[PDB]
Each structure stands twice: as structure tokens, then as C-alpha cells.
């Protein structure tokens, strides 16, 4: 599914993302926006290293979820990458929380550094009731 902006904001807030390990909701929104356009079913193959990115946060198979087909990979979220292609984003959120328990936090995603870091991200949550 492709979430509408404010629907997603409220969905993430219910799942406990607001301020998780210091990360505001508007940061998570900015991440989802630029990773996937708020689209849960997106996959992107990285020909360079044979990994794939999955779902609304484009979480990578080398470190985070198992797809069977990524050489040398691990699965720190202990999920099938299939779980990151559901319309229900609970598993994706749990996995995103796992990512940001590591030292880099939200910097783990380059798109966040590119499109969100050091910017005014207030617009992502404007009017959403969060
Ligand atoms: Cl901030
Ligand atoms: Cl699973
Ligand atoms: Cl689903």
C-alpha cells in the first residue's frame, strides 16, 4: 500500500516511533518519504553488492532481514524480508527500531543524510494531529 502522509504519521505514532532513540516523527516521515514514497511493497535490487532494499523504509537484506539470496548476509531483525512488504507496517517499524539501536542511529540510511539531516522537516507532520 501507498500511505497518505498524515495517515502514516498517525500510524507511526501509534507504533511508538515518536522520539524513539531520540528520533522525532518528522524524521521518520522524511525517511519514509525519500526511501519509498510511503510505499510498503517497494523493492530495489542493488546490483553492486547483490543485496535488496525492502518496503517503506527500504531496509537492506545484507544486515537486517533474510532473503536467502544475499551473500554473507545476516538478519538482525530476525525476519524474512517478506515481512517488510506487508501493508501492515508493525514488523517494518520493529526492524527500523532495531536499526537505530545501533551506533549510527538514523544515519544508517544515506537518504536520510541527503534529504533530511540538518533540514527543516516540520512539513512532513503538519496538520496530521501528531
Ligand atoms: Cl530533529
Ligand atoms: Cl517473517
Ligand atoms: Cl498486510
From Swiss-Prot:
SS bond partners: 6-128, 30-116, 65-81, 77-95
InterPro entries hit by this protein: Glyco_hydro_22, Glyco_hydro_22_CS, Glyco_hydro_22_lys, Lysozyme-like_dom_sf
An annotated GO cellular component: azurophil granule lumen
Localization per record: Secreted
Catalyzed reaction equations: Hydrolysis of (1->4)-beta-linkages between N-acetylmuramic acid and N-acetyl-D-glucosamine residues in a peptidoglycan and between N-acetyl-D-glucosamine residues in chitodextrins
EC number: 3.2.1.17
Keywords of this entry: Amyloid, Amyloidosis, Antimicrobial, Bacteriolytic enzyme, Disease variant, Disulfide bond, Glycosidase, Hydrolase, Secreted, Signal
Residues of the active site: 35, 53
Family, similarity comment: Belongs to the glycosyl hydrolase 22 family.
Note: Lysozyme C is capable of both hydrolysis and transglycosylation; it also shows a slight esterase activity. It acts rapidly on both peptide-substituted and unsubstituted peptidoglycan, and slowly on chitin oligosaccharides.
Disease linked to the protein: Amyloidosis, hereditary systemic 5: A form of hereditary systemic amyloidosis, a disorder characterized by amyloid deposition in multiple tissues resulting in a wide clinical spectrum. AMYLD5 primarily affects the viscera, and the predominant clinical features are renal dysfunction of varying severity, and intra-abdominal bleeding. Inheritance is autosomal dominant.
Protein's recorded name: Lysozyme C
Organism this protein belongs to: Homo sapiens (Human)
